[PDB]
Every structure is written in structure tokens, then in C-alpha cells.
Amino acid sequence: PQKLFGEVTSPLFPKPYPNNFETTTVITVPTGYRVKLVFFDLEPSEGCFYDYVKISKSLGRFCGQLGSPLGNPPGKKEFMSQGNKMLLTFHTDFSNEENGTIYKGFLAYYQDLDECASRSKSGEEDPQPQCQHLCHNYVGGYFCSCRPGYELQEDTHSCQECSSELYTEASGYISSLEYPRSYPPDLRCNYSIRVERGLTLHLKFLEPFDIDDHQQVHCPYDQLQIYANGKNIGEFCGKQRPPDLDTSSNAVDLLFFTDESGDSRGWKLRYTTEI
Amino acid sequence: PQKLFGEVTSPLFPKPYPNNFETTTVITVPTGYRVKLVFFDLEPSEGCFYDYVKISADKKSLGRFCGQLGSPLGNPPGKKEFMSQGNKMLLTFHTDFSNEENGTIMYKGFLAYYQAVDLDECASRSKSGEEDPQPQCQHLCHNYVGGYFCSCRPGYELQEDTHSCQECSSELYTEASGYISSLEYPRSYPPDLRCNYSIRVERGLTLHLKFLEPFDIDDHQQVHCPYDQLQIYANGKNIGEFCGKQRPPDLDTSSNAVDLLFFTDESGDSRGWKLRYTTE
Ligand SMILES: *[C@@H]1O[C@H](CO)[C@@H](O[C@@H]2O[C@H](CO)[C@@H](O[C@@H]3O[C@H](CO[C@H]4O[C@H](CO)[C@@H](O)[C@H](O)[C@@H]4O)[C@@H](O)[C@H](O[C@H]4O[C@H](CO)[C@@H](O[C@@H]5O[C@H](CO)[C@H](O)[C@H](O)[C@H]5O)[C@H](O)[C@@H]4O)[C@@H]3O)[C@H](O)[C@H]2NC(C)=O)[C@H](O)[C@H]1NC(C)=O
Ligand SMILES: *[C@@H]1O[C@H](CO)[C@@H](O[C@@H]2O[C@H](CO)[C@@H](O[C@@H]3O[C@H](CO[C@H]4O[C@H](CO)[C@@H](O)[C@H](O)[C@@H]4O)[C@@H](O)[C@H](O[C@H]4O[C@H](CO)[C@@H](O[C@@H]5O[C@H](CO)[C@H](O)[C@H](O)[C@H]5O)[C@H](O)[C@@H]4O)[C@@H]3O)[C@H](O)[C@H]2NC(C)=O)[C@H](O)[C@H]1NC(C)=O
Ligand SMILES: *[C@@H]1O[C@H](CO)[C@@H](O)[C@H](O)[C@H]1NC(C)=O
Ligand SMILES: [Ca+2]
Ligand SMILES: [Ca+2]
Ligand SMILES: [Ca+2]
Ligand SMILES: [Ca+2]
Ligand SMILES: [Ca+2]
Ligand SMILES: [Ca+2]
Ligand code: NA
Ligand code: NA
Numbered sequence: 001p002q003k004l005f006g007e008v009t010s011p012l013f014p015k016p017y018p019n020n021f022e023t024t025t026v027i028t029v030p031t032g033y034r035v036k037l038v039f040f041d042l043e044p045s046e047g048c049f050y051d052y053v054k055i056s057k058s059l060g061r062f063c064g065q066l067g068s069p070l071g072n073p074p075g076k077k078e079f080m081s082q083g084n085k086m087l088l089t090f091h092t093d094f095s096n097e098e099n100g101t102i103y104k105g106f107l108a109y110y111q112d113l114d115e116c117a118s119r120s121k122s123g124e125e126d127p128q129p130q131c132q133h134l135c136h137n138y139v140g141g142y143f144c145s146c147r148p149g150y151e152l153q154e155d156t157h158s159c160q161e162c163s164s165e166l167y168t169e170a171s172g173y174i175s176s177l178e179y180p181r182s183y184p185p186d187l188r189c190n191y192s193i194r195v196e197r198g199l200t201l202h203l204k205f206l207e208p209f210d211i212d213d214h215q216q217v218h219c220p221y222d223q224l225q226i227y228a229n230g231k232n233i234g235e236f237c238g239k240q241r242p243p244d245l246d247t248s249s250n251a252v253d254l255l256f257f258t259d260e261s262g263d264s265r266g267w268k269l270r271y272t273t274e275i
Numbered sequence: 276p277q278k279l280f281g282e283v284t285s286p287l288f289p290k291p292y293p294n295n296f297e298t299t300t301v302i303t304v305p306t307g308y309r310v311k312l313v314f315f316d317l318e319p320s321e322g323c324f325y326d327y328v329k330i331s332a333d334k335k336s337l338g339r340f341c342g343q344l345g346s347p348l349g350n351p352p353g354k355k356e357f358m359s360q361g362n363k364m365l366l367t368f369h370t371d372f373s374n375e376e377n378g379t380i381m382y383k384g385f386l387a388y389y390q391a392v393d394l395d396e397c398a399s400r401s402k403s404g405e406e407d408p409q410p411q412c413q414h415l416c417h418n419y420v421g422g423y424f425c426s427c428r429p430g431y432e433l434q435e436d437t438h439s440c441q442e443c444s445s446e447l448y449t450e451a452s453g454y455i456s457s458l459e460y461p462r463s464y465p466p467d468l469r470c471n472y473s474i475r476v477e478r479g480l481t482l483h484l485k486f487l488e489p490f491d492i493d494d495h496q497q498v499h500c501p502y503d504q505l506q507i508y509a510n511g512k513n514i515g516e517f518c519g520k521q522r523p524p525d526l527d528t529s530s531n532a533v534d535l536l537f538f539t540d541e542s543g544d545s546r547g548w549k550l551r552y553t554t555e
Contacts, residue, residue, distance in 0.1 A: 036418060109417060138280075139420070
């Protein structure tokens with residue numbers, strides 16, 4: 001159910017616990033949270049065979065009076081669960097007169113984290129919430145966010161096609177995915193711009209340019225084809241920047257033909273207007 | 276109202292921002308909480324005079340910055356977390372009349388996110404525990420969603436302020452053998468208290484008594500017990516005004532019911548007293 005916090009009396013508190021008893025109380029804090037727990041007048045015993053409060057994978061089993069040394073006394077230390085569920089167990093054997101010739105009990109209190117905080121043991125072995133770029137530590141679970149562009153559909157894990165990234169402004173910057181790091185392969189991209197009618201576009205490339213090339217046949221691996229006003233104007237590849245050009249039109253289409261194994265760095269560009 | 280999370284767009288996003296503009300968006304997450312905020316394509320400038328985004332917590336200046344992302348020496352913010360002291364967040368967006376720098380006329384804007392992570396004053400204590408308002412607990416406290424409350428001494432529950440953790444009205448005991456001590460042994464006793472601990476055993480028995488060490492009640496050596504008094508009423512009548520440093524001796528009650536009473540001074544130096552009782 002819905003449990004902010006609560007109090008667990010050992011049954012009959014503060015009147016002593018009845019001997020011969022084993023009752024379990026189970027916390028169910030809201031799912032996706034961690035529980036907190038603090039306070040113990042019971043019978044000490046080495047290893048707590050006589051009496052013990054078993055509490056949780058297993059946290060511990062202890063017994064004993066508060067200010068008593070060599071009685072395994074638990075105290076008031078915090079201990080957080082990994083998941084939404086907490087488990088208490090109370091066991092008192094038949095004798096509260098152990099070490100005989102004839103204990104009140106215990107009254108405690110109970111009350112979240114995010115796997116982006118420290119990636120407990122690994123990122124790809126537990127049920128994968130992790131993200132390559134980043135994630136956020138919030139109250140109410142955890143969601144993801146990546147390097148800007150598309151918003152990584154429903155799973156929010158992967159950080160994702162180039163259908164139409166739109167741009168209808170005069171001058172802008174366009175870079176390949178994740179520049180200057182190695183470019184992503186196996187992509188058929190289209191960057192299209194239709195500028196306000198009555199202009200041509202002045203173009204100026206930048207370095208280091210990087211597309212894996214072949215010096216015997218130009219651009220078998222990757223291709224960078226440029227379609228002007230509806231027609232083909234160049235298949236570029238290599239490492240050194242091609243020279244500046246003028247379009248003489250008000251609208252264009254750019255496309256990217258990449259390989260299936262990326263070693264190179266990429267390509268970055270700038271475009272301006274002139275009347 | 277009810278605000279889990281949300282995003283603050285520079286007006287007209289992703290289309291560029293209109294110059295001559297100053298719009299302020301204020302987060303009001305539920306009270307008793309903190310806001311968290313992370314992401315910026317704006318105009319860099321030394322000191323962010325041209326354009327700047329001015330942002331602050333409860334009642335304190337966080338910062339004012341600007342500049343493009345991969346730009347050094349532009350005071351660029353990034354996506355770093357910054358938590359408020361309080362429940363209310365304050366964003367301010369300022370654009371001067373000129374974004375047209377280098378003869379190279381223009382920035383998309385900014386699209387951010389804010390959350391409502393709780394705060395629990397039992398987690399830490401900024402500079403001290405006794406200097407911040409309503410010091411909720413001396414002993415311990417609890418870290419919960421919606422603030423923090425306290426509780427002490429499994430008897431009474433620390434009246435209205437829920438700060439102090441203090442009275443001995445009637446602490447009852449109807450068991451055979453038990454241990455009784457002054458409050459907070461072996462440490463020094465609280466003075467100025469009129470306490471009454473009484474026990475009535477099932478009829479047909481007497482009670483054997485055995486003190487424990489070291490006994491301590493502030494005394495005077497010429498006339499006994501001026502500051503503190505330890506008066507003991509058996510079967511309804513008085514049996515002793517005891518004080519000093521050495522333990523009194525064992526006794527036999529000869530009754531099925533008794534009454535204890537304690538007269539404290541208003542200044543404690545001693546430690547206290549501990550005892551054990553059995554049946555016959
Ligand atoms: C990269 O991305 C660009 C994006 O623009 C893209 O260019 C676009 O190509 C497509 C190709 O399908 C064009 O779509 C249609 O093209 C029709 C051409 O007709 C010839 O070819 C047909 C076969 O495809 C053939 O059947 C015909 O007989 C003829 O031979 C055209 O008829 C059609 O017209 C509609 O256009 C728009 C919708 O885009 C409608 O609305 C108008 O929109 C514009 C703004 O876009 C404006 O605001 C107007 O006011 C508004 O009315 C319109 O009413 C028609 O119904 C349609 O155009 C795209 O037009 C073309 N985009 C352009 C020209 O801007 C590249 O090809 C991509 N590169 C790739 C894929 O490699
Ligand atoms: C420390 O704590 C003890 C408490 O144990 C306390 O002793 C208590 O003193 C008071 C005195 O006010 C007793 O209360 C009543 O005493 C009546 C005596 O009557 C004489 O004195 C009156 C003035 O005090 C005077 O007006 C009369 O005319 C007369 O001269 C007595 O009659 C009365 O009887 C009622 O007792 C109980 C309520 O206590 C009633 O209910 C019963 O309760 C028990 C369990 O408690 C059980 O469940 C029964 O089934 C139930 O019926 C009953 O009906 C009578 O009406 C009442 O006793 C306390 O009794 C007395 N407690 C004792 C003796 O245990 C000390 O003074 C304290 N010391 C401090 C504070 O320093
Ligand atoms: C166990 O026996 C009695 C309990 O009646 C106790 O007094 C004694 O000290 C105990 N033995 C120990 C502590 O060795
Ligand atoms: Ca027992
Ligand atoms: Ca979370
Ligand atoms: Ca390559
Ligand atoms: Ca501006
Ligand atoms: Ca709190
Ligand atoms: Ca004294
Ligand atoms: Na690249
Ligand atoms: Na004391």
C-alpha cells in the first residue's frame with residue numbers, strides 16, 4: 001500500500017513480550033523507494049539463540065539489553081533496503097527466564113535512491129535502466145536524457161532516424177552526430193533548408209575534415225552527396241576540406257551516406273546569405 | 276498547486292528569443308521541499324552584461340550567466356545540479372536590445388527542467404544544530420517525505436514545540452522483579468522534579484529489596500538531605516529521608532503495596548541511584 005512511515009510495537013508494548021512467540025510484520029513502503037529504520041529491551045545471548053529479533057537478503061538477528069556489553073545489542077543505527085519491501089521478524093523461545101529465577105520488547109520506526117547515483121555493481125547486467133550519456137536522481141523514480149536531438153523513444157535508455165531536421169533561418173551551424181568524436185555509421189540522412197525566397201547562400205567549410213576515403217576510387221565507403229535546387233552537385237569524402245561555393249538558389253537538400261564501421265572524425269559546416 | 280516536474284522554455288522556443296524582453300518564471304514546488312534544476316544557446320560575454328539569465332534560490336543569489344555550450348571563457352553553465360534552500364524557485368531571463376554582435380546577426384534560447392526533491396533536516400546540520408530555527412531534537416530525529424517530526428522517552432511525548440524532550444505523572448509497574456533507576460543514570464539527575472513511582476503487588480506477598488552502586492544524592496553532613504530528599508512511603512506511611520554517597524542497606528517491606536517519592540533540588544551535581552526488587 002501507501003506507507004509514509006509508521007510505528008511497530010512489539011506486541012503488548014510496553015508490557016513485556018509474551019514468551020513462545022514468532023510474529024512477522026512486513027513493511028511495504030511505496031514501490032520504487034528505500035525504507036529507513038531506527039529505535040530494545042530483550043534477553044541477551046551469544047548468537048541470540050535464547051531470544052532474537054530477526055530482521056531483513058538478510059540484515060541481522062540480535063537480542064540483548066541496550067546498555068549491556070557482550071550481549072549483541074543492536075542500537076539505533078540506520079540500515080536502508082535495496083528495494084520497496086522490508087521484513088521484520090520476532091522470535092522469543094519458551095523462556096523469558098533464561099538464566100532463570102525469573103523484557104519489555106522493542107518499539108521502532110520505519111520510513112528512495114536512483115541507480116544513476118553509483119551503478120551498484122554493473123551497468124549492463126542488472127535490468128538495464130542505465131544510460132550511455134546521463135540520467136537524474138529524483139524522488140519518484142528515475143528517467144533519462146541524452147545528447148541533444150531526438151528524445152530517445154519510450155525506453156529512455158538508448159539515446160537515439162534522420163528524416164527531416166528543419167531549419168528556415170538565414171545563417172546556421174550544422175555538425176554530424178557527435179563531433180569531433182567518431183561519426184555514427186549506417187545512416188541515410190537528409191538535412192533540408194528552405195530560406196526566405198529571394199536569396200542565395202554563401203558556404204564556408206571547417207577542419208579537420210574526416211571521412212574515410214579511397215584514393216583509387218573516390219568515396220566507396222562513405223559518401224557526402226549534396227542536392228542543390230533538386231539536382232546533384234557533389235560526392236565528397238576524404239580528410240582535407242573542399243573549397244567554398246555559392247548556391248544561387250533559395251532552397252537545397254543535404255544527405256549523408258556513411259559506412260557500417262566508423263574510425264574517422266567527421267565534418268562541420270557554416271552557411272550564410274547574400275542578396 | 277501540484278507540480279511534480281516541468282520544463283521552462285525561453286518564450287518562442289526553438290525559434291530565437293525576441294530582444295527587449297525580461298520574463299520571470301517562478302517554480303512553487305510543495306512547501307518544505309527543495310527544487311533541482313539542470314539543462315543553453317545564448318550570447319557569451321565577459322560578465323554576462325549583454326544578455327544573461329539571472330537565477331536564485333529562496334532568498335539568495337545563485338548566479339547570472341550566459342554563453343554557448345562548447346565555448347570556453349564564456350562563463351558557460353552546462354548541466355550541473357543546484358539545490359535550493361527552500362520550496363520556491365526563481366528564474367529570470369534577460370535579453371538586451373542587441374543580440375547582433377560581430378555584424379553577424381544571431382541564438383535558439385533555453386529549455387530547462389526542474390524537480391521537487393524533499394529535504395530532511397535530520398540528514399545534516401548546516402553550521403550548527405542550536406542556531407537554526409525550531410531545533411527539532413536533542414537526541415535523534417526522523418527523515419521523512421514532507422519534513423521531519425520528533426519523539427522522546429517512551430513515556431511522555433514532548434509537548435507542543437516537539438523540540439525539547441523533557442514529567443513523572445505515574446510510571447506504573449505490576450511485575451514481580453524489576454529494575455528502577457533515577458532518570459538518566461549513571462549520569463547526573465535532573466533537579467526540580469516531584470516524582471511518584473508506586474507498585475502494588477498481588478496480595479499475599481512481601482518484598483525483598485537490594486540497592487546497587489555507586490549510590491549518589493547530594494547531601495549535607497551536619498543535617499541530612501537539605502538539597503535533595505529521597506522520601507519513601509511504605510503501606511501509606513513514611514519510612515525514610517535518605518541522601519549521601521554510600522549505598523543504603525537491604526530491606527524487607529512487609530506489605531503488598533508501597534509508594535516512592537523524590538524531592539529534587541534545583542542544581543544537580545551527583546549521579547543518581549539504581550535498585551532491584553524481588554518477592555517472598
Ligand atoms: C530532403 O527533404 C526535402 C524536403 O522538402 C525533399 O524535397 C521534397 O521532395 C518531395 C518528394 O516527394 C516533395 O513532395 C511532393 O513532390 C511532388 C512533386 O511532383 C512531381 O513528382 C511526383 C513524384 O514524386 C509526380 O507524381 C508528379 O506528377 C510530379 O511529377 C509535389 O507534387 C507535392 O506537392 C505538395 O507540396 C507541399 C507539401 O510539401 C504542399 O503544401 C505546401 O507546402 C509548402 C512548404 O513545403 C508551402 O508552405 C505551400 O504554401 C504549401 O501549399 C502542396 O500543397 C502540395 O500538395 C510535394 O511537394 C516535396 O515538395 C519536396 N520539398 C520541397 C520541394 O520543399 C527532398 O526530396 C529530400 N531528399 C531526399 C529524400 O533525398
Ligand atoms: C503516588 O501515587 C499513589 C497512587 O497509587 C497515591 O496514592 C493515592 O492517593 C489518593 C488520595 O487522593 C487515593 O485516591 C482516593 O483515596 C480515597 C481516600 O478517601 C479519604 O481521603 C479523601 C481525600 O483524599 C477524602 O475525601 C475521603 O473522605 C476519605 O477520608 C479513596 O476513598 C478513593 O477510592 C477510590 O479508589 C479508586 C480510584 O483510585 C476507584 O476505582 C477503582 O480503581 C482500581 C484501580 O485503580 C480498580 O480498578 C477498582 O476496580 C476501581 O473500582 C474507587 O472506586 C474509589 O472510588 C481513592 O482511592 C488513591 O487511591 C491513592 N492510590 C493508591 C492508594 O494506590 C499517592 O498519594 C501518590 N503520591 C504523591 C503524588 O506524592
Ligand atoms: C546465571 O544464573 C543466575 C540466574 O539465576 C545468575 O545470577 C548468574 O549470575 C548467571 N550465571 C553467570 C552470569 O555466569
Ligand atoms: Ca524469551
Ligand atoms: Ca528515484
Ligand atoms: Ca571509417
Ligand atoms: Ca538579444
Ligand atoms: Ca525532513
Ligand atoms: Ca543536589
Ligand atoms: Na562525426
Ligand atoms: Na540520577
